[PDB]
Amino acid sequence: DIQTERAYQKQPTIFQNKKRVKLPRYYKNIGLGFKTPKEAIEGTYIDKKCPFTGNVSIRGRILSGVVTKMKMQRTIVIRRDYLHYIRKYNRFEKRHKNMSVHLSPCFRDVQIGDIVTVGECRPLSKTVRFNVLKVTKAAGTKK
Amino acid sequence: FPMKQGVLTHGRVRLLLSKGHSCYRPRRTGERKRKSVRGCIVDANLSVLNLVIVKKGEKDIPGLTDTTVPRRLGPKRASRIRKLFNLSKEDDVRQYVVRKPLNKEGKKPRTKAPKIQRLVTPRVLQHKRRRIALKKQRTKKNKEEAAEYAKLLAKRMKEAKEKRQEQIAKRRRLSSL
Amino acid sequence: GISRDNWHKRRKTGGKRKPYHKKRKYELGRPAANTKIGPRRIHTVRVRGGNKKYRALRLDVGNFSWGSECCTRKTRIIDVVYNASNNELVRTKTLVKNCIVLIDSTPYRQWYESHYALPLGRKKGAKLTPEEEEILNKKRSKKIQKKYDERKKNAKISSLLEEQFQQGKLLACIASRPGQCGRADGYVLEGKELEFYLRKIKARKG
Amino acid sequence: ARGPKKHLKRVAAPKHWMLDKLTGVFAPRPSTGPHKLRECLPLIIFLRNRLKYALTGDEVKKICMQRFIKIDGKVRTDITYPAGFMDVISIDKTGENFRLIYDTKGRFAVHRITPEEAKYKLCKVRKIFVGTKGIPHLVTHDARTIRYPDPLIKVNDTIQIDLETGKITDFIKFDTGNLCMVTGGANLGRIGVITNRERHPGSFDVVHVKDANGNSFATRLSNIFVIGKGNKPWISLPRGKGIRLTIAEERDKRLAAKQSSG
RNA sequence: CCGCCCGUCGCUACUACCGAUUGGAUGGUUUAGUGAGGCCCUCGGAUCGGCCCCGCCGGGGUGCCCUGGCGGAGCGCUGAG
RNA sequence: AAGCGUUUACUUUGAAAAAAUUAGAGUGUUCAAAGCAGGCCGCCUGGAUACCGCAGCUAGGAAUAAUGGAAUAGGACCGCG
RNA sequence: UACCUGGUUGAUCCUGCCAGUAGCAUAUGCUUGUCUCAAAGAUUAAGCCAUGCAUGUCUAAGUACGCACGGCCGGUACAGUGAAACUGCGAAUGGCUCAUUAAAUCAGUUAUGGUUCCUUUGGUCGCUCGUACUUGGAUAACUGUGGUAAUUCUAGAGCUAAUACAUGCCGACGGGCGCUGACCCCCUUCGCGGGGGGGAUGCGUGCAUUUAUCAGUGGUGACUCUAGAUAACCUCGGGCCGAUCGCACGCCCGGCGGCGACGACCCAUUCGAACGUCUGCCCUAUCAACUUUCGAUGGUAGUCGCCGUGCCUACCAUGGUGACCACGGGUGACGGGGAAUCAGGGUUCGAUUCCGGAGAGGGAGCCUGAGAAACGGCUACCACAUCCAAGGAAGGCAGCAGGCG
RNA sequence: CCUCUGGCAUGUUGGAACAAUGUAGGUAAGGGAAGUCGGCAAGCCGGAUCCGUAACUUCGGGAUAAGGAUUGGCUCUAAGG
Ligand SMILES: [Mg+2]
Ligand SMILES: [Mg+2]
Ligand SMILES: [Mg+2]
Ligand SMILES: [Mg+2]
Ligand SMILES: [Mg+2]
Ligand SMILES: [Mg+2]
Ligand SMILES: [Mg+2]
Ligand SMILES: [Mg+2]
Ligand SMILES: [Mg+2]
Ligand SMILES: [Mg+2]
Ligand SMILES: [Mg+2]
Ligand SMILES: [Mg+2]
Ligand SMILES: [Mg+2]
Ligand SMILES: [Mg+2]
Ligand SMILES: [Mg+2]
Ligand SMILES: [Mg+2]
Ligand SMILES: [Mg+2]
Ligand SMILES: [Mg+2]
Ligand SMILES: [Mg+2]
Ligand SMILES: [Mg+2]
Ligand SMILES: [Mg+2]
Ligand SMILES: [Mg+2]
Ligand SMILES: [Mg+2]
Ligand SMILES: [Mg+2]
Ligand SMILES: [Mg+2]
Ligand SMILES: [Mg+2]
Ligand SMILES: [Mg+2]
Ligand SMILES: [Mg+2]
After folding, report:
1. What is the distance between the terminal CA atoms of chain C, rounded to a whole angstrom?
2. Same-domain status, C53 and C100
3. Nucleotides on strand H with an atom closer than 7 A to protein CB?
4. Within this chain, do residues C122 and C155 fall inside the same structural domain, yes or no?
């Protein structure tokens, strides 16, 4: 399950090899009343960029979106959907911004269409700046 | 164009020259500039060749040896006075510094000695006393502040411990309600 | 020079940013250090804000922490054996962060035999006739001998570590960035990460 | 720009200095110091526009460099020194003491002070730092690093600093009921009692404060400077006492007072 | 309604279009060759010092030690470059 | 009084909004455009206030317009093993 | 001031434009008596420039033996003004122009818990356990031989200073703190043994750097924060712990002294800078698919960087954007605050004095510095262009005037 | 093209010279079709891999269009059972 890739995949603040005679894992609460999920504590995964078990700090803005693509490795694309007002025609126009959000692997079952909440953090890659903090399931689909 | 050391060729070259290099003087701090110089090894094709006589021949030459030119300035560092006139560290340097005579047209004859640096004067010794007096002042201030903060934190933690002892006794008697 | 700028590259949409200014000085890259293994050579770069960075260029020693026992000693780097990024950075011996080097286990052997007074390594049958290792292992007082006899219950080591001590050189991971700090520090690999990198090394060995 | 700017324009200067428009192209760029640039009032502006003790820049230079102006108990000689909030000007020769407190509007008010009040000032702490040997540190609003404070002093409180020593004498804690001078925003200069404190994690915490005449108004917490327990201050208050009478009441007061003057 | 009126043809003027000429001239981006110059690395070592090694000794200590001067030289080591 | 109360759009308020310009208060620059001045026989005072669309932040309203919840009961609530 | 009027017909009533009407800028004509304000080489050629000037700077407080002037009180150095030159600082501000630039710049907005910061204000600055009554050798200015046709060119020789450059200890300092521990002493016990202290000798013994480990003083909404303990390292292209200067001039009986100036590692502070978050840009479909092993979108590990980051490298994944208009092109396009016209909406403009950006003929690369990819700094190349003894040398008006086009 | 099993003796003669004309191979400075009816003959190009490929068109082609780059030896690494 773990140690897929080239280097050893461990959490950097834990010292796992103290002399004996299950590893403890580092995890934190990210503030703003976000409940850390049970799979973050009970899991066995590693992640640099998970907000709950990694070296990121959720700051700034706390936005939302709908899951619209999950084709990437440990990041999804959300589709922020909003309106915009022209001062001439007292009307609106429906716009959107697709944006790439690092989805931690503690959110283990999510399908596209779910309304996730994201938080601004350190820029994790070129076009990724947010993390999925909590996931709210789409309407219906309880089965 | 001048000759400079270590270029080691025969013709003329162009070098980037900087602070610390010869045949160049900088104007701004950090300026470097391609100037054109001449190598070490020599030929006919130059105006002036410079020579330094490094061992005197057995016969005199009138332009160079017969007259002598003294050093223009006396020494100015106190230990340089010491190692010119061969002093110890107890004999007074200031009467042994060289002074020059002064004679011109229409003016009073004078004499003139340089203000010698690095001698030990009572002002230097006073500054050296002042910095260590300031050091002991700073440690006295530090230990005073640390002791009064220790007294204050003992008092504040006594206050907080009595506060939580009030909480535990009050909710024991509330449990006795 | 070498630039570190997002404006020379495409958008998220695959577009083309035409630049609005030429290359800046905070957008600066300098070439790699590529710290080999040899007698110590460190050049000093002065950087933004007037500070100093220490390019190692060839580098022999570094202090490694064996942290399950918590002993951290200055040690001679023997070899580079595994690198998670590039195998030609193993093929040439380049000290980088999180590469696997080998280091001679003599200071940790000295510490273990001086702290617990038990031999490690030590193919059995030989005793050092210079006699200093056995004057380290023997002849203590009856007040200090109970201290050694109670510390010698916590004196059994991992067998992977112990055969590394018997071969005489340990596997260790570079933690610092030697093109940045100028040092080649790090920690001795023991544990499941040691078994991970060992099976990586011998699978690469084939 | 290829570095830090050194000039400041006349129009781009802050409005509460109340510079005019047609003397010169520039305004004095205040030097770096304990108070911010847009929240200071420099010494050239204080001696030239307000007090009229100097007419020109040369006159304020020669006043400040025959060593007469004593800011905060210390001799400060450059004319572009940022004299900021709660600073104490000690005019030694002419015998005055000023405290740069704000006005009922956004100004700094010329506020004459007795020497026994002018030997202290009041400072809002900005940080609690812990230095190298467990040594606590206050960081006030005017760059004072004060090592070994009282542990009951926390991050948004104020302290009464003795000036020739720099030591703490007493402190007011940020609670509901205490006073407040307001150092920033649209409610700048107002004085009231702290009615409410509203916590916003991540955002800027907002404090509701109510003055003497029943007007309640909000302000971000960075703009709030408590100045005493209850209604009773620990300094003096300027003329008007931070009320902000409306424009109708100001009109009525000026015509009433000047028809009584005649 | 002897009104109006439409097109070809013939003369005149003007504006465009197609048009062989693998047409022509200027910009701009750029594959690929050559590539100055700076910077970095690996070398290099013109030059300039310093310490030892001896010979001749003056000033000082209980024949060894330090100095100050004269030289000579291994370049034995060593530093900048 | 501290922590919590399906969510948005809308509405109201508060915050934060750089000066200049614009509107506009005061003021006989001799009037006016202007200017931040000036007034009383040292004192008196001014150097306001409003607007600053859109997005963001805060607190009230719950009509309108969306969205949900319990329907293979994987439902609330209340206690028990 | 929420305005219409002439013109198709023989005459009419309409749609519809053409033309009148009022501003508002730019030019141009004819005319001009007073007085207060005031734009002014932007449009075309970010085309080219003769000449002169536009950034230099000295306090009691870094160096003062240029009689260059100078006072006398000497012989116990240097009275004092003081050109010169080293040192320090600034030259990265200002000013000009608007060529580039279409989510770029820019505006509001927040973030740095993801970084650097000369300066100024406040801390710190005998915490370290190991010639000081002051260490070394060069160099400019000055004298003296020059060279070239010529430059703000500089060479060989003499001298001589530092807050330039280097080197480097004493005082606190008498022991405490953690190891190692030879040994010493006591109680219990047939007894091994257990318990209890003291402890010579040796090792380490501060802040900063770098690594790893342990515990959880003060904080935040949230740290892998701050502070503690431990094991070590500490870069010779070295990090701190002062070999500096000026005024007064007193006190114990040689030693104590006050007020300052400068400089320094770090921490704050100030001015900021720098990347980021959400949202907003004109025309064009005769531009409908674009981007990708030459980085396009992610992952893991590094390299570089001041930091985060495909920024770059290696290996994997095959993604990313698009009718909600991408991508490509155009712009007589720097962005905004703002200007004109206006009933309410709008329409057009903004090169232009405030803020932010860009640039110094076009591109590129760098040195010094805290800060520059600086051009009133340097090196190349291209275009241009000046002086000449034909070998060479020097330049950058979109700074202010001014000249040509 | 070179070789092993197999086969042969250079194809109806040998020797000695190395002149002209040949016949058949080649090479040539500088210029590059000026030679001649005419680029006749010769010459250039040429395999493979990685890119790149226009007009026109019966949409199949054109096409190896054109135009570039790479290529040896050795020491390795990675992937394909
Ligand atoms: Mg409208
Ligand atoms: Mg405004
Ligand atoms: Mg008709
Ligand atoms: Mg008619
Ligand atoms: Mg018209
Ligand atoms: Mg007149
Ligand atoms: Mg022009
Ligand atoms: Mg500027
Ligand atoms: Mg254009
Ligand atoms: Mg343009
Ligand atoms: Mg503009
Ligand atoms: Mg224009
Ligand atoms: Mg500007
Ligand atoms: Mg520039
Ligand atoms: Mg030009
Ligand atoms: Mg440039
Ligand atoms: Mg110029
Ligand atoms: Mg400039
Ligand atoms: Mg001007
Ligand atoms: Mg034959
Ligand atoms: Mg035959
Ligand atoms: Mg035959
Ligand atoms: Mg030929
Ligand atoms: Mg040929
Ligand atoms: Mg012919
Ligand atoms: Mg022919
Ligand atoms: Mg042929
Ligand atoms: Mg063809």
Report:
1. 43
2. yes
3. 76-78
4. yes
